């Protein structure tokens, strides 16, 4: 304001607030693997 000595001090502004929404989506992968391939593979297909 820069108030004067005697000026009937008036009220000043106040910040206006904004709200931002983060919808928090999901990301999914579903690989299909044959059960016999998992059993007779020399490589650990489950950890790969």
């Amino acid at each position: 304001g820069w108030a004067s000595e005697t000026a009937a001090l008036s009220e000043t502004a106040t910040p206006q607030i904004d709200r931002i929404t983060i919808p928090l989506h999901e990301l999914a992968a579903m690989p299909k693997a044959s059960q016999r391939l998992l059993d007779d593979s020399a490589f650990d297909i489950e950890t790969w």
């Binding site: 690989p31 299909k32 693997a33 044959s34 016999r36 391939l37 007779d40 593979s41 297909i45 790969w48």
Partner: peptide
């Protein structure tokens, strides 16, 4: 990685 019958898969 599936169906061990197929070579490329």
């Amino acid at each position: 990685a599936l169906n061990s019958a197929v070579a490329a898969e």
